[PDB]
A paper describes a structure:
During cell growth, PG endopeptidases cleave the crosslinks of the fully closed sacculi, allowing for the incorporation of new glycan strands and expansion of the peptidoglycan mesh. Outer-membrane-anchored NlpI associates with hydrolases and synthases near PG synthesis complexes, facilitating spatially close PG hydrolysis. The protein level of MepS is known to be regulated by the periplasmic PDZ-protease Prc (or tsp, tail-specific protease) in complex with the adaptor NlpI42. The structure of NlpI in complex with MepS provides molecular insight into NlpI-interacting endopeptidase colocalization, while the Prc-NlpI-MepS complex elucidates the molecular mechanism of NlpI-mediated MepS degradation by the tail-specific protease Prc.
To characterize the basis of how the lipoprotein NlpI mediated the endopeptidase colocalization near the outer membrane, we determined a 2.8 Å resolution structure of NlpI in complex with mMepS by X-ray crystallography. The structure revealed a heterohexameric complex with a homodimer of NlpI bound to four mMepS molecules. Moreover, the SAXS profile of NlpI-mMepS is consistent with the crystallographic results, with χ2 = 1.73, confirming that the hexameric structure does exist in solution. Surprisingly, the intrinsically disordered N-terminal of monomeric mMepS becomes folded and dimerized upon NlpI binding, thereby guiding four mMepS to form two asymmetric dimers bound to a homodimeric NlpI (namely NlpI and NlpI’). One protomer (mMepS-1) of NlpI-bound mMepS has the extended α1 (residues Q28 to W51), while the 12-residue segment comprising Q28 to D39 lacks a defined secondary structure in its apo state. This segment simultaneously engages in extensive interactions with the h1 of NlpI and the h3’ of NlpI’ located at the dimerization interface of NlpI, thus contributing to the extension of α1 by approximate 3.3 turns and 18 Å. The core structure of mMepS-1 mainly interacts with that of mMepS-2, while the extended α1 of mMepS-1 engages the interface of NlpI dimer. Notably, mMepS-2 of the complex structure simultaneously engages mMepS-1 and one protomer NlpI but not the other NlpI’. We conclude that the colocalization of four mMepS molecules can be mediated by a NlpI homodimer, suggesting that multiple mMepS may work cooperatively and thus enhance the avidity of mMepS-PG interaction.
Residue numbers in the entry:
A (entry chain A): 26 to 287
B (entry chain G): 22 to 113, 115 to 168
C (entry chain B): 28 to 287
D (entry chain I): 21 to 168
E (entry chain J): 22 to 160, 165 to 168
F (entry chain E): 22 to 113, 117 to 160
The structure:
């Protein structure tokens, strides 16, 4: 509304073809435990990409009951316990990921975020700095690290992020979200930089999912709930269901919701 | 491509391959083949012709021939997250030499002196020359961040 | 702008979908028992925006039990949604050929003819549908939109009359009051918020309401505002609203217009 | 709305055909590295035509002729830029005079090669770009034989 | 009742009930039953009492007993557009407002003062003058 | 959040969502069948006979014939917590139905046969006694 909006993403024909076929194969009895667990895991991922998280979790749970050595299952179970507000069960699920596969790098992030939301900022920083130095030029690694260092002290969280920015190669578009957070560029400027980079609608929807979450967190840090409630909603309205920004925009809205009662 | 994208996607999604096992099938078969620069048969092969041929025959994955080009495929990998099937790259007269990690600090490559062999990353010559790694076997993602 | 949390799949929907898979996978359903279940899963997939899957289930149900006007209905809608208006009219004919008592075909075919530009035939169908429930504001809105193509000033007085000749209860009569010029856009939105209760109720109001404001803005050649108002309709994720379905269609049409 | 741009029929046959590459690769999982032996049909050793014949039988239920000469006469001729997964791809060997494999998209095909046994290869490997000849679509959308 | 809701939903979407014939099961069982104001048994029943037990036992729908409340259930239906299982209604005489259930072909079924529960024609002239309203009480909401 | 229900809460909802469907499938068949004390066929059935039959046919669960003995099955439930498929007991002999949610229950009545009743019918409200849960 005089602002930057995408057509909310819709299920792709590919997603529906693949789900329709999976259902045929899973209905057969010509499947090993091993190849069945695999279809369940991969259908879970698909269901999770359409925002059907109860069904996905259901498939994952069944995949694990057949093939226990599935760090990728435990990762998603952790994520869903985070979105549910069960941070304690979530820490434990990510613990499991890294027992099974120490190389399953992404659980450092996901447990970083679970600790962040669980109010365990020092421990979160431990995991999100680990994550960050595995790929410095990923802007979202520095953004989550900023978010966790923020509550301990706003001032040296920004001096660190500035550090990360200058130290990075500055290619990836997300460094613009960073530039805004530093106060290098306006929010106005961030939004035109956004449209410039964004090609088609899917690209546009990805850019707005990620960006409106980080703007939401920026406004929430100022104590503007009205503005943040809106930016979290516009984030979700892109229907990029499997973005962490999408999932935790939903959690923030849940937290904002419950504050607002009495 | 709108059938073939679905078909390619479906193949990646059902296939749960034993990555080390497949690499060692190839090594068993190619063990001790001589060095020939620009060669890509069993009469002689260079390090990157060996990689290219391995990822195609064993994983149906199409890599470029150039080592410069192989060093920009997939995502880079820090040394502690190294997995079987990751390309390991080294400053070694090419400037640039490529093998495939196979675990326990070992990698498979076509070397000058010995042809196709397993070496240790700890061998003093290679630890000094270790340069980076790339993951090229990688379940491709639904939506992408910017 | 007034925003809901984009609707998310409910526990009930996911529970039922999970169960329905087990039942359909079992080999002890009579043809009829399976047809009705396929149909019903179809409805549920549609309510989640999974229309290829929905249409696939509907198509298989019809294979088994051919006498299903309810299936031909949806199928017709999916053809409307796909710009396939001639095929759609034909699907809706089949509905009334089996059950002439099936009101909703009149609407859906009404709208298909609207988008097909066969404005007399659409006025026929939409006035038929109006006459069943004079008090359903949306019937009067669709009628107006169809009549608006031929004479907007006359369409506007016959809508005034559709208003006074009604209970004026259901919320969507506020949309109509805005179309009439009785209230501003701002007042309409104040009332929208006042009338909505929980988030689901708010989403439903914003899905219907932003479609109708989208069409208002189209009608003045403001494609920017219309485009945005259509996207904010779709953003509520009320996947089985007429206003949602054809918000997507409008955007598609605006999509091809600009992008040439 | 543009998964609805595809008709229910196009959808029906996308579901039928989406797994076709994974089925050929299922065959490859089990037959990978099996030696070339002219006139052979087992994991003891197999020729290009036998590997092709067996793949279509086991994966899809499709009866094809034994010889390469009868196979290339099957189905319908396909130009290079219209190749689709499942298409026979024909080269001139000159060991007999004729060599056949299965296209799996992205310029690659599976086959029983004379030199390396059953493998994946590129259509752009100089050796095989030079000897390409034609392509045959023998498998229809409904998994019947393709019309001439 | 997170559960009971789903159970209720599932029963609704799985049941494809035959409205006309379930009503006619009721009327089979109840035909001839005497009129008794405020009664609700096979020993005597009035017209709303009969409606209430029919929709309860045959459809698990719970209607109020007051004939006034029963006519503000569901949504109104024009006489043109009548379907089996709609309530038909008639102006109050000395036994209150009258209500029956439509069974198609211009036939309704009702507890009557004169004959007990019986099938009548809408086209019987007593009932054309007295006809008043109909209500449909069978089957994301627009606002 | 759909995900507040745990995975076990979900598996359980999936197992149990059709429990009313199945009682009602019984009812679709049995609907309007006569009363007869000591009857277990479709010519005439009593309250305990209809319950016993429902649990047999729908839940593969063999309950005793008499109402006396059906009171002793499963565990006790209070009104607050009634779930579909719970036995509801009234003083009437005493009398057995099956709760189907929303204050209604299915049963063979002595007067009207196999019917649906409301718990809030005055007759039945003052005669409620206890309930039994018998599904595992």
């Amino acid at each position: 509304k005089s602002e930057v909006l995408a057509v909310p993403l819709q299920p792709t024909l590919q997603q529906e073809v693949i789900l329709a076929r999976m259902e045929q194969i899973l209905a057969s009895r010509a499947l090993t435990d091993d190849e069945r667990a695999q279809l369940l895991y991969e259908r879970g991922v698909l269901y999770d990409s359409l925002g059907l998280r109860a069904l996905a979790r259901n498939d994952f749970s069944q995949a694990l009951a057949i093939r226990p050595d599935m760090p990728e299952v435990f990762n998603y179970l952790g994520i869903y316990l985070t979105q549910a507000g069960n941070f304690d069960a979530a820490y434990e699920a990510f613990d499991s990921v890294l027992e099974l596969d120490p190389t399953y790098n992404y659980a450092h992030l996901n447990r970083g975020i679970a600790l962040y939301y669980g109010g365990r900022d020092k421990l979160a920083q431990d995991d999100l700095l680990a994550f960050y130095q595995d790929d410095p030029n990923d802007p979202f690694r520095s953004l989550w690290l900023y978010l966790a260092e923020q509550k301990l002290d706003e001032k040296q969280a920004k001096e660190v992020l500035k550090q990360h920015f200058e130290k990075s190669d500055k290619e990836q578009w997300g460094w613009n979200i960073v530039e805004f957070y530093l106060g290098n560029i306006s929010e106005q400027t961030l939004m035109e930089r956004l449209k410039a980079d964004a090609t088609d609608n899917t690209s546009l929807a990805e850019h707005l999912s990620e960006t409106n979450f980080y703007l939401g967190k920026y406004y929430l840090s100022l104590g503007d709930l009205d503005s943040a409630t809106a930016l979290f909603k516009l984030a979700v309205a892109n229907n990029v269901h499997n973005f962490v920004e999408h999932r935790y925009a939903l959690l923030e809205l849940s937290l904002l919701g419950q504050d607002q009662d009495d | 491509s709108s059938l073939q994208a679905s078909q390619d996607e479906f193949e990646n999604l059902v296939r749960n391959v034993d990555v080390k096992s497949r690499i060692m099938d190839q090594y068993a078969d190619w063990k001790g083949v001589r060095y020939r620069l620009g060669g890509s048969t069993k009469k002689g092969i260079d390090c990157s012709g060996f990689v290219q041929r391995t990822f195609r025959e064993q994983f149906g994955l199409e890599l470029p021939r150039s080592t410069y080009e192989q060093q920009e495929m997939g995502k880079s990998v820090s040394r502690s997250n190294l997995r079987t099937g990751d390309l390991v790259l080294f400053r070694a007269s090419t400037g640039r030499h490529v093998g495939i990690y196979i675990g326990n600090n070992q990698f498979v490559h076509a070397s000058t002196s010995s042809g196709v062999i397993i070496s240790s990353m700890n061998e003093p010559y290679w630890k000094k020359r270790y340069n980076e790694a790339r993951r090229v076997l990688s379940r491709s993602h639904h939506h992408h961040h910017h």
